[PDB]
């Protein structure tokens, strides 16, 4: 057998997949995952895939730090294996692309509402939103501008709504980003699709 290599964590809104190399030849894999002090849990038993969905294990506690390892078993005592990098979902998962749910003119102002971003974390029959999981750690940022602007303006919110001042008779365009300001890397989501008045 040959040991797996280039173990990489692929995670967005807590949907977390471990990926590795190489494509197997006369060998199969099994993945294990644990917290620093917990027991090892096996997943993706004797797979020929070079990926393993570990979402159901990391969502038990997104704030814990997980280590995974990929075992190589011959098709025909301890097996060869390789450890993954450590992964702390709360600090490292990519923030998903947001969607502007609605915008409404209330006279000289516009309310812009961000759709609740669904995550893979469950709380008895329902998927928690990004705000349910992050709370005060999550903000949304809005880029807004009128057709004749010399650039764009920025607004920020602790909720999923913005209330901005607009010029009368001007049509505005909007785009939003999910942000975890306390992070140093992977701080922001990609931008939402643009919506215009």
């Amino acid at each position: 057998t040959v040991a797996a290599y280039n173990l990489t964590w692929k995670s967005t809104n807590f949907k977390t997949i471990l990926e590795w190399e190489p494509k197997p030849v006369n060998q199969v894999y099994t993945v294990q995952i644990s917290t620093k002090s917990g027991d090892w849990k096996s997943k993706c038993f004797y797979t020929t895939d070079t990926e393993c969905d570990l979402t159901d294990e990391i969502v038990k506690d997104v704030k814990q730090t997980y280590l995974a390892r990929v075992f190589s078993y011959p098709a025909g005592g301890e097996p060869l294996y390789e450890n993954s990098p450590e992964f702390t979902p709360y600090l490292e998962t990519n923030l998903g692309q947001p969607t502007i749910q609605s915008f409404e003119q209330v006279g000289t102002k516009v309310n812009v509402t961000v759709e609740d971003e669904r995550t893979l974390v469950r709380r008895n029959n329902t998927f928690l939103s990004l705000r349910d999981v992050f709370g005060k750690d999550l903000i949304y940022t809005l880029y807004y501008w009128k057709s004749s602007s010399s650039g764009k303006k920025t607004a920020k919110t602790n909720t999923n709504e913005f209330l901005i001042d607009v010029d009368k008779g001007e049509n505005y365009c909007f785009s939003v980003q999910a942000v975890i300001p306390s992070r140093t890397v992977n701080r922001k989501s990609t931008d939402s699709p643009v919506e215009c008045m």
Partner: protein
Amino acid sequence: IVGGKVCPKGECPWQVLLLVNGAQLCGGTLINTIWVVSAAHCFDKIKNWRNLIAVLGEHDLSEHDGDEQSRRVAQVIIPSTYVPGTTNHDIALLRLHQPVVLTDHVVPLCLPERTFSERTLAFVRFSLVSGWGQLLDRGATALELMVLNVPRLMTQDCLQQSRKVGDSPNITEYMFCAGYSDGSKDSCKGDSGGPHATHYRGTWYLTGIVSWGQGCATVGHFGVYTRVSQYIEWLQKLMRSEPRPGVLLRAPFP
């Protein structure tokens, strides 16, 4: 045991104290009313084979109480492959001359099936190690039974995380590492032969035997334990064997 706690009386009921000529020799683990598992290296210097005693229900070596039970050791079975003065195949199976009586203070540890021990118990992070060994590297031994929780490592990790020592013994498939490399906690010389017991879904099982290491709680080093799962079939067949005239039996392995 370095950095552990006193095992409260009756909470390590399978621990065995082995004596030779009435003096402390090693630890052991009771696995049924007649059979004790210990380390082969404990018997390297024995001359008086008829003077071996197993004590069950022991706790405080300075006081005797009505929970202690002593039995003569009738047979000491060691793998023929074991070489005195070396680490590989460090296991001994001891037959008591008369069974001990099971009580609230004397209970055997389960000897598990091999496949269950390999695929389930081996991945339980922590297990307990115990004994009346040294409280510090090369220091005095303990009067009250000590116990310590240690995490297990796969051998590849143990080798990668251990400080290199020139010409150190190989860690074979008949051994496993457990413990801490920060110099805080470990089993020690006087704990040899004692259990490394693993708790799984309400039952405790024998997974290792205190065997060797580089000093005791030495920075950059883990404790090394005999990998009991490799000997299940060997132990089971020998427990069904007829007694022999002499005490020592070097039995074929596998």
